[PDB]
Symmetry: C4
Subunit: 156 residues, 4 copies
């Protein structure tokens, strides 16, 4: 039985006839089929959109900007903020807002984040401007909340 072409697993094998691995999904085992869909989804999504800031992550960058370390400019923070908002989805926040009792101050912040997520989906270029207009101390508050929600959602 021919094994699945690992190039095709990540998308499209580019070796033409030379390549002697399977490119025929019908004979692939399921796990390879699963993995490919993940790479292909990643590509689809990308399509409709420095060394230590990479190793930090968007979270690392943002946490660093808060503690004023690793030389994170406020501009870079705002951009990273945009990337974080994109990774979040309003519906998960709304779900959390529903668990809160009225006039809980958490509800104010949930709605603030939610409105940011929505500005960001419409036009991330200006959402980033907005975020830059904020005074440092309030931007950091917001970032810290967004991060906390982000962590929160992901562990339940």
């Amino acid at each position: 039985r021919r094994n699945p072409c690992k190039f095709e697993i990540r998308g499209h094998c580019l070796n033409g006839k030379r390549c002697h691995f399977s490119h025929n999904y019908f004979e692939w085992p399921p796990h390879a089929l699963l993995v490919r869909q993940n790479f292909m989804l990643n590509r689809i999504l990308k399509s409709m959109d420095r060394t230590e800031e990479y190793a930090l992550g968007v979270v690392g960058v943002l946490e660093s900007y808060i503690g004023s370390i690793n030389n994170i400019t406020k501009q870079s923070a705002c951009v990273a903020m945009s990337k974080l908002l994109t990774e979040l989805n309003s519906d998960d926040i709304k779900k959390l807002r529903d668990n809160e009792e009225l006039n809980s101050p958490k509800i104010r912040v949930y709605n603030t984040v939610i409105s940011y997520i929505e500005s960001n989906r419409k036009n991330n270029k200006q959402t980033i401007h907005l975020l830059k207009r904020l005074p440092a101390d309030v931007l950091k508050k917001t970032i810290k909340n967004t991060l906390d929600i982000h962590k929160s959602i992901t562990i339940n």
Copy 2:
């Protein structure tokens, strides 16, 4: 290594600090299935064209809102009803209706309604902003009829 739960929902944002797997080849299948679902949802949201965001219109659902507007409860304005109608139409697909219309014998009155819903679904895909205008122009009693039929189809399709 277990799969990064952040990555399962999309893209882990912790850089090198995160010590969970981000390598799809070593994930077990179930996680791979789940991630595709979150990612599909994102892709779809991403190519999409304010009252019913509010706390109780969220817990109602679009169906709840619409059923409430029909029975004149939970304070659902006619505007909010029309918007929700748009969200419902979006969730439906013409082909499933056409399949139902084919089971009907000629001059069955059901066929009229199926085609009405179908044309609404199509107006909606073209331009939901005006489809919602249209829907607002309807007299309350006929809008509610339409909504009710659309809801019945929606339920019907989903259980077979």
Copy 3:
């Protein structure tokens, strides 16, 4: 909790009332598979001017639906079920869309040089490409063809379509 069948087809719209699972992590794999298929269909539909062009709104009608695009096209060839030449050309467009050049190129590679099949493969391929660029005019082109040659082309395209799908 079992998976919400509404969510299986996309997005459950019943809010808090609905007592079925909407949490992918607890769904069994088969439901997860099925949902991806409905969602893919929606995504694709969502990035698709046609039903404005003459002859197209026509084949939504009750029997042109039961025929299929293939049925319509095979009917136009045998001059039955009242298929206008306009409707044929539109259906042709829908068929071309369903095909992908790469699968044809793969077949062309199995042919030995100067095999006449290679000419027809390339004709279909070029049609597929006109169609992806601008299906509105591809349909015009197809209408300009003399009936007897259009029917030839349709027949070849259909044969490829069948051929690909069974290997």
Copy 4:
């Protein structure tokens, strides 16, 4: 039990009521469901995409074959065709995987220069592949071939770990 319609497996069955195979995902077995997603993903991707190397032997070569051939000046690969194929390769690559490799390098490793060069090419290419191909044509043959060779090496490298 009805088997899954093989036409539907590749997308949308076009035979209407005549077709007696299942088109109901709920009764399909999982493997068919997996296969269909792959064909449908391919279609979706093709659908949001922005002539020489369609020809019979440039197809059997692949984009890699074309590029490797242009480097060794064989199989009659024009420099124009090389540049286009380069674009197709860049598209198949993703910056993030390169960044991951650049992180494994120690500072001032010359590899880092090349990783960033490729990365910036990938990004020009995603923005506007038409001009990325112009750029690539402006390069002197000997440097274009260097770049192509590096890109190919990365491409192979990523794919085997």
